[PDB]
Amino acid sequence: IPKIIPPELLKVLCEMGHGDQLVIADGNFPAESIGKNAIVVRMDGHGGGEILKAILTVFPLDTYVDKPATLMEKVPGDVATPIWDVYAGLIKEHDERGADAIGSLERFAFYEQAKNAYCVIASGESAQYANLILQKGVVF
Amino acid sequence: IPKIIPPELLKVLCEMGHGDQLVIADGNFPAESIGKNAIVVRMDGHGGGEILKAILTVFPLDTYVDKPATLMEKVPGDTVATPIWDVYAGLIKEHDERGADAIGSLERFAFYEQAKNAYCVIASGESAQYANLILQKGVVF
Amino acid sequence: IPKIIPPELLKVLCEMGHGDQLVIADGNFPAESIGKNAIVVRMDGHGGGEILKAILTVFPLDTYVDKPATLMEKVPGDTVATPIWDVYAGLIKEHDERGADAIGSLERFAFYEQAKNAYCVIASGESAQYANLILQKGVV
Amino acid sequence: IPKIIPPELLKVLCEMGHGDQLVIADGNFPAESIGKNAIVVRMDGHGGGEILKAILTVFPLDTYVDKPATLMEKVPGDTVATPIWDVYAGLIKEHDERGADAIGSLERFAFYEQAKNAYCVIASGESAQYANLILQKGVV
Amino acid sequence: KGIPKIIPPELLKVLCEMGHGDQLVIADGNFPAESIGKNAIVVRMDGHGGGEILKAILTVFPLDTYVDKPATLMEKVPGDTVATPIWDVYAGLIKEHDERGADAIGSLERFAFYEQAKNAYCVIASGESAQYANLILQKGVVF
Amino acid sequence: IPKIIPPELLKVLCEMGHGDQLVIADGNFPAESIGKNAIVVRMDGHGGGEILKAILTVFPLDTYVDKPATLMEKVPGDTVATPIWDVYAGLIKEHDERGADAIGSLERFAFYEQAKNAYCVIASGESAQYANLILQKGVVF
Amino acid sequence: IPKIIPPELLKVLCEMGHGDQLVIADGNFPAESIGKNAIVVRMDGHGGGEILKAILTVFPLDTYVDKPATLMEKVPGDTVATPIWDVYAGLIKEHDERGADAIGSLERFAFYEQAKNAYCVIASGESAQYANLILQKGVV
Amino acid sequence: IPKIIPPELLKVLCEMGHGDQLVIADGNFPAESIGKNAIVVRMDGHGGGEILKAILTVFPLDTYVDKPATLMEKVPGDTVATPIWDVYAGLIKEHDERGADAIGSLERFAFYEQAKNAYCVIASGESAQYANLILQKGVVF
Amino acid sequence: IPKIIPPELLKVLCEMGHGDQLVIADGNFPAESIGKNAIVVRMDGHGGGEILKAILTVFPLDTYVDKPATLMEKVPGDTVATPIWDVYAGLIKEHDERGADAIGSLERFAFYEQAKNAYCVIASGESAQYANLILQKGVVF
Amino acid sequence: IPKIIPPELLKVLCEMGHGDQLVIADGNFPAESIGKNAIVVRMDGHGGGEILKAILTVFPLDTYVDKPATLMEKVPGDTVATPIWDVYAGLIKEHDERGADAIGSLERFAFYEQAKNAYCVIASGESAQYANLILQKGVVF
Ligand code: NA
Ligand code: NA
Ligand code: NA
Ligand code: NA
Ligand code: NA
Ligand code: NA
Ligand code: NA
Ligand code: NA
Ligand code: NA
Ligand code: NA
Ligand code: NA
Ligand code: NA
Ligand code: NA
Ligand code: NA
Ligand code: NA
Known part of the structure; x- marks a missing residue:
């Protein structure tokens, strides 16, 4: 288990199922308001890359x-x-698709999709446009 | 009463009435998000068959x-x-003479929509894919 | 005041006003799910007639x-x-001069729809099918 | 399973373990105050005998x-x-071959003290005085 | 309709669910009703005096014999x-209601009174402007 | 401050701003159901007149x-x-030179719909005919 | 950081992200009802100017x-x-070169509707009318 | 009513009775921890004098x-x-002829112990040290 | 991580630290009342052996x-x-060289008193003789 | 204000006053159980030094x-x-000329007892043992 994941986030990752989404929110992202109906986990001291690496060790991306x-x-x-x-x-x-597994959404469409996330992770990532939605796949 | 049913699930089964539905969710199912407005009971160490067997002992299927x-x-x-x-x-x-004929089906996304209306979602640890099952309660005559 | 009415139901009956509805639910009725946004009072050991008689002693029907x-x-x-x-x-x-003329009916699913608007659902143990009753409060 | 037991009380009876106590409170008993730290289930329309009969069908007394x-x-x-x-x-x-030899007693105020330790207090409508009973759960 | 109109639905619930030996406090306007009643049910009755509240309560509440x-x-x-x-x-x-009348009324020193009131099931916060108009009532039996 | 106003209602009256509404509900009004999304203050022992009189000492009517x-x-x-x-x-x-001219009316069911939007419903014991009253708060200049 | 900002408002300002809005409500504004689904922070002893000046030291306006x-x-x-x-x-x-040109306006009832979407409403004691101000957060 | 008092504090002052205490806490005081079992009202932008002045307009000191x-x-x-x-x-x-003679004192830890029993703690921004003040409410005759 | 552990128990096991205790309660144990101040996780369909096996994969025993x-x-x-x-x-x-030597015991009522202090109580359906077990968490080096 | 401090912890640090304590808990520390009556803030991906450095930028140590x-x-x-x-x-x-002389110590179990009185427990991921630190807040002059 990656050391940076707090117990609440480990619980979240385990209880998500096929098709559930989470958002890795960058430091500029309105994580609390977008995630008002979701579980918001604070990771203010961490960047997007280390968070993604940690999540991918335990979270399969939807095929x-x-x-x-x-x-x-x-x-x-x-x-x-x-x-x-x-x-x-x-x-x-983790996934042979690499960059081909990454799509995109226009800013306001991105917000709309993010409001449907099960969990929003509020990072401190300082790079702009570092927001990332991940959709969970199957454990076979 | 089947030993595997926890007190909360016994209460749920009892308070469900005619036409109420529950979902037996497989291990891959998004039980918590689908069941956000329902009662979600964890049964992670049990498979779909063992759960269904236990439920059917105490839960009449709708005629x-x-x-x-x-x-x-x-x-x-x-x-x-x-x-x-x-x-x-x-x-x-x-339990029901209709057997396989009592089993219908829904397209994946339609199934999610129907499951969101369930009174209770049981999160099993069933490893088989497509092992989700919605059950509708009948009458106690 | 009928002895069978618990303190919580007495409070409910007193705080309902002109036009509010309550449901006497039979043993087969989905009282908890239908009553998700209502006050659900359990009366599992009682029949519909006993509950109705008790209620009508303190609850005027809408004229x-x-x-x-x-x-x-x-x-x-x-x-x-x-x-x-x-x-x-x-x-x-x-309690009401209209007697049976005060009673209407709804198709099963329409009944469920109306019952979702009730202020209070009373979950009886009435074993008879079709023993559900919606009551609308009158003026005191 | 006795018809008069509501779903919450069924949960209570199942989740109680060896040594847990419940109180069948008569109509004069201060069930809500004594039960402030317990689960209070209303059974206002039922007598002590009816309730005891129902409980003993599912509740073993401690040996x-x-x-x-x-x-x-x-x-x-x-x-x-x-x-x-x-x-x-x-x-x-x-239900228990001990019969009357299984029944002890406590002075009024000592009874209140013991009852405050109950897991569950059932508030009956029993009109007889001194109709309270504490029951301690045995092994299954 | 035998129930006094001034009693709100919450207080009717309280009066019904109290049993033998339970106490409530009719608190005068100067009483620290919210702090004393921190672990109790506090019902506001700010527009009513002590006498009208007592009169209403006694119609439904037997005093302990x-x-x-x-x-x-x-x-x-x-x-x-x-x-x-x-x-x-x-x-x-x-x-x-009770032949004992004045003989049914005891008293407690001020701070002892506060200590006893902290044990009440319900504190009714009246608007009674008179001082020392607090009254603890203990519920009796319905035979 | 009129004595009949409980501390919670004083807070409500102070928290309300320009355009906010409160309902003085009579004895028959379904105050709890109508005010399910509002603050319901019980004033069961009080009439509509005495309540209005008290409110107007601290509540300006909207101009x-x-x-x-x-x-x-x-x-x-x-x-x-x-x-x-x-x-x-x-x-x-x-308080307001408009007097009677400041009072409008709504059909029964429209009145209920407006009341559902009120910040606060005061459940009075008023028995007088047609005693329900909605008040809309004005500006303090 | 400005002395007048209470700990809860500090947390609000930090957790807001790009696009989130807050309302500085004048003394006559229906701050509690408008902010029913928002965080309402009381600042009754403070004027609109004092509050805006404090907020702008820590809150970038959206470019x-x-x-x-x-x-x-x-x-x-x-x-x-x-x-x-x-x-x-x-x-x-x-703080912002745009000055007066960064300020738009909304008709009264439109303003109330937009204010209902705010993350936070600050309830000032500002005695001037039309002293309400909605602010939209920019990037850091 | 002094404009600086928020609605919640007005409610607090009204519902306090004879002998109840409140604490005007200075900017250094551990208001949230001391007030853990009380009502804590934030007044971070205000000093002790202005708060005391405002409170005394509506709060009689115990005789x-x-x-x-x-x-x-x-x-x-x-x-x-x-x-x-x-x-x-x-x-x-x-407000009170006793003036300075109505003011007593407690050693620091005794003061904290007393403050833990207060009904309400007001968290000021007062920068003066030893600017904490406990007030005990009197009777409304 | 063993499939039988529900998400909530995974969180519990992770957030426990050095010296924290959990109870594996048998089917007769009063798990809800003993665990009134703890987190109680239902595992009604499982035995003491399988729960212990699962826990020990992730939970070091205190040295x-x-x-x-x-x-x-x-x-x-x-x-x-x-x-x-x-x-x-x-x-x-x-997992631990001490084996049986790592196991002590408590008289029935002393065991209840210690169980009341546990962080988490797992309510199993174990029917074996004298199956209740308290575990104390060690260090991760 | 150091980037690693989340909004909730910023609020905690501001609302603490003179004599309030926080605990920087190492990764082995029972942060949740010890912090049952405190505010527990997770900082699992951060070490003790990093957290202490950030805290001392905004938290004066008691003189x-x-x-x-x-x-x-x-x-x-x-x-x-x-x-x-x-x-x-x-x-x-x-930050403080006292340096190492400002650091005392408590025996393990006495440390747990004292930590239970903290306003806030910060649950770090610090892998070193005995890396727990209790900090007592001073005044702002
Ligand atoms: Na997949
Ligand atoms: Na699935
Ligand atoms: Na059927
Ligand atoms: Na039915
Ligand atoms: Na009528
Ligand atoms: Na009794
Ligand atoms: Na036994
Ligand atoms: Na008596
Ligand atoms: Na006006
Ligand atoms: Na305004
Ligand atoms: Na910007
Ligand atoms: Na005085
Ligand atoms: Na160890
Ligand atoms: Na440690
Ligand atoms: Na200092």
């Missing part, structure tokens, strides 16, 4: 959709996003 | 509908076998 | 509607006898 | 103590008849 | 000479 | 609407005297 | 919208002077 | 004790000026 | 005491076989 | 006692190295 990981598209007009490659690299560790 | 038991249909392109469906049919036949 | 008492109609093809309907009519006639 | 059933003694100088004590002894005899 | 003095007043602080005519009003209202 | 007080319209057949309406008009006149 | 601050428009016919609007624009100018 | 206001004594060895003590005396003198 | 597992002493004069004690000893031996 | 920081003494016979104690002393020295 029943082509893109079980979802990023937020940059607002038209709007910075470099190397964390997206970090995310792809981490997914590649 | 006011043709198919009081509902399975989740396999997603198109998913060819996994489902011998557990046959296990369930055998268990149902022991 | 601002035709039919302040409502039965559940038998489902198509169900041929079970319903002698309790005459018992209920007899009891209502002890 | 690890001499007197698993306990009555409240009459206040010195209160000469009121207590026929219900013989009714209780008869009911106990039906 | 297993003790000599089921009603208890607060004793005046030594040196406080304030008139207390409501004590005789309370006696008259009790006498209407 | 941004013509009729900040609302009565329930009589049942279509009913010719009964409504002396409490004149009582209410009189009490309003003490 | 992803042109007008992240919103005033309530005067009711047509209500000709009351609104000098606080200039006080607000001045305070905004200290 | 059944000699000293209804209580300060915290300086820890032996803590040489610090406490000009706010004279401020407090002045404000009390406005 | 700062000699006997981190505690059994309930038999009723005086009871000479009934206690085969589950050997089952327990074997399961402990798989 | 009204000689030793406002408290360590847990090693169990007699447990000779495990404790280099973190020097790390802690160095971090304290950055």
Whole structure:
């Protein structure tokens, strides 16, 4: 069990089932309001990459959709996003799809999808557009 | 009364009335999120057959509908076998003469929508896929 | 004040006002699920007639509607006898001059729909089928 | 399973273990105050005998103590008849060969003290005075 | 309809579920009803006096005959000479239901009174403007 | 501050702002059900007049609407005297030159729907004919 | 950090993210009813200017919208002077180049509707009318 | 009613009775922990003098004790000026002829023990040290 | 991680620290009343052996005491076989060299008093003789 | 304000006053059970040094006692190295001239007893043993 996962989040990850979603929220993300109907777990001292790595050790990404990981598209007009490659690299560790497992949603569509999440993890990730929705797959 | 039923589930089964539904959720099912507005009872160490057997000893299946038991249909392109469906049919036949004919089905997403209306979701540890089962309560005459 | 009425139900009956409804649920009725947004009072050891008689001693039936008492109609093809309907009519006639004319009916699923709006559901142990009754409160 | 037992009390009876006590409270008993730290189940329309009969069908009396059933003694100088004590002894005899020898007693205020330790207090409508009974659960 | 109109539904519930020996406090306007009643049920009756509350309660609440003095007043602080005519009003209202009348009323020193009131099942917060108009009532038997 | 106002109601009256409504409900009104999403204050031993009188000492009536007080319209057949309406008009006149002109009305079922939106319902013991009253709070300048 | 901000409001301001709104409510605003589904923080002893100045030291205004601050428009016919609007624009100018141009407006009832969506309503004692202000949080 | 008092504190002051205590806590005081079993009202942007002035307009000080206001004594060895003590005396003198004589004191830990029994703790932002004040409520005759 | 452990028990096992205790209660044990101040996890369908086996995969037994597992002493004069004690000893031996030497005991009422202090009580359906077991958590080095 | 501090912990640190204590719990510490009556904030992915450094940026150590920081003494016979104690002393020295002299100690079980009185327990992931630290808050002048 990854050391950074608090007992409440371990419980959450275990009780999620096929198709449930969680959000890794970056430091700018309105995690408490979006997650008002969800379980919000604070991880303010941690970045998106280390959180994703920890989750992927125990959380299978859904194979029943082509893109079980979802990023937020940059607002038209709007910075470099190397964390997206970090995310792809981490997914590649566990899932052969790697970067092809990652889709995207326009900002407001992303918020709408995130309000449906079972759990929002409030990170301290300082990179912008570092939000990531993960959809749980099957344990076979 | 089957030894495996915890006091809370005994209370649930008793307070359910005619037409109420419960869900026997397999180990892959999103029991907590689907059951967010229902009573969720954990039974992680038990399989679907053992739970269904216990429930049927104390829970009459509805005769006011043709198919009081509902399975989740396999997603198109998913060819996994489902011998557990046959296990369930055998268990149902022991209590209800309709047997397999009392078992209907719903497309995956339709099944989720119906399960959200259940009074109670039982989170089993059943490892078989598509081992979810909705049960509708009948009358005590 | 009828001895069978528990303190909580006395409070309920007193705080209901003109137009509020209560359901006397028979033993087969889904009282807890239907009453999810209501006050559910358990009276599992009592029949419908006993409960109705007790209630009517303290609960005026609405004269601002035709039919302040409502039965559940038998489902198509169900041929079970319903002698309790005459018992209920007899009891209502002890308190309201309209007697059986104060009793209407709803199809089974429409009955459930109306019962979800009740202020209080009383879960009886009445063994007779179709022994449910919705009552609407009048003025004091 | 006796029809008069509501679902909450069935849960209570099942989750009680060896040595847990419940109180069958008569109509004059301060059930809510004594039971402030316990589960209080209302049974206002039922007598002590009816309730005891129902409980004993599902509740084994403790054989690890001499007197698993306990009555409240009459206040010195209160000469009121207590026929219900013989009714209780008869009911106990039906389920436990000890019969009346399984029944002890406590002075009024000592009875209140013991009752405050009960897991569950059942508030009956029993009109007879000194019709309270503490029952201690045995092994299954 | 035999029930006094001033009793709110919560208090009717309280009066019914009290049993033999349970106590309630009719708290005067100056009484610390919320703090004393921290572990009790507090019912607000701010617009009502002590006499009208007592009169209403006694229509539904039998006073305990297993003790000599089921009603208890607060004793005046030594040196406080304030008139207390409501004590005789309370006696008259009790006498209407219980032959003991004034003899059914005991008293407790101020701080002892607070200690006993903390044990009450319910504290009724009246608006009674008279001092020392607090009254503890102990419930009797319904035979 | 009038003595009849309990501490909770004082808090409510202070918390209310411009446009907020309260209901003075008569003895027959379904106060608890209508106010299920509001704050319900019990005043069972008190009449509509005495309650209104007390409230108006601390509650300004809205001048941004013509009729900040609302009565329930009589049942279509009913010719009964409504002396409490004149009582209410009189009490309003003490604080607001509009007096009776500040009182509007709503049909029974529309009145219930408006009452469901109130911040607070005061459950009085009023027995007078057609005594329910909605009040809308104004500005403190 | 400003002395006037209580610990609960500090937590609110930290947990808000990009796009979240708070309302600074004037003394006449229906802060509790509007904020029924929000966090309402009482600041009854403080004016609108004092509160805005404090908030802006820790709360970045959104640059992803042109007008992240919103005033309530005067009711047509209500000709009351609104000098606080200039006080607000001045305070905004200290942190944001846009100054007065960062302030939009909503008709009275539209304003109430939008305020119902706020994460937090701060209930000021501001005695001036039309002193309400909605603020939308930007990025860090 | 002084404008600085929030609705909840108005409710608190009204529901306190003869002998109940409240604490005006300075900015250094452990108001939340001391007040764990009480009602804690945040007034972080206000000083002790302004709070006391506001409270005294609606809160009578107990005449059944000699000293209804209580300060915290300086820890032996803590040489610090406490000009706010004279401020407090002045404000009390406005309402109670006893003035400075109505103010007693408790050693630090005795003070905390007494404060734990208060009905309400008001958490001020007062930066003056030893600016804590316990007030005991009197009678409304 | 053994499949029988429900999410809530996983959380419990993770949040326990050095010296914390859990009780594996048998089917006759008063788990809800003893555990009134603890977290009670229902495991009604499982035996003491399988729960212990599962727990020990994730839960180190304390080495700062000699006997981190505690059994309930038999009723005086009871000479009934206690085969589950050997089952327990074997399961402990798989993880801890002390094996049976890691197991102590308490008289029935002393055992209840200690169980009242446990962080978590697991309500099993174990019917074997003298099957209650208290476990004390060790260190992760 | 250090990035690692979550909103809830910021609120805790602000609302603590003079003499209130918090515990930085190491990964082996029974943070949830000891903190049953406190606020427990999870910081599982962070070590003791990192947390102490962040806390000391916003939390003044009490000068009204000689030793406002408290360590847990090693169990007699447990000779495990404790280099973190020097790390802690160095971090304290950055804010308080007392440095290591500001650190006292309590025997293990006495440490648990004292920690039960803390306002807040921070559950770190610190892997070193005896890395628990109790901090007592001072005044802001
Ligand atoms: Na999958
Ligand atoms: Na599934
Ligand atoms: Na049927
Ligand atoms: Na039915
Ligand atoms: Na009528
Ligand atoms: Na009795
Ligand atoms: Na036994
Ligand atoms: Na009596
Ligand atoms: Na106005
Ligand atoms: Na306004
Ligand atoms: Na921005
Ligand atoms: Na006085
Ligand atoms: Na160890
Ligand atoms: Na430790
Ligand atoms: Na200091």
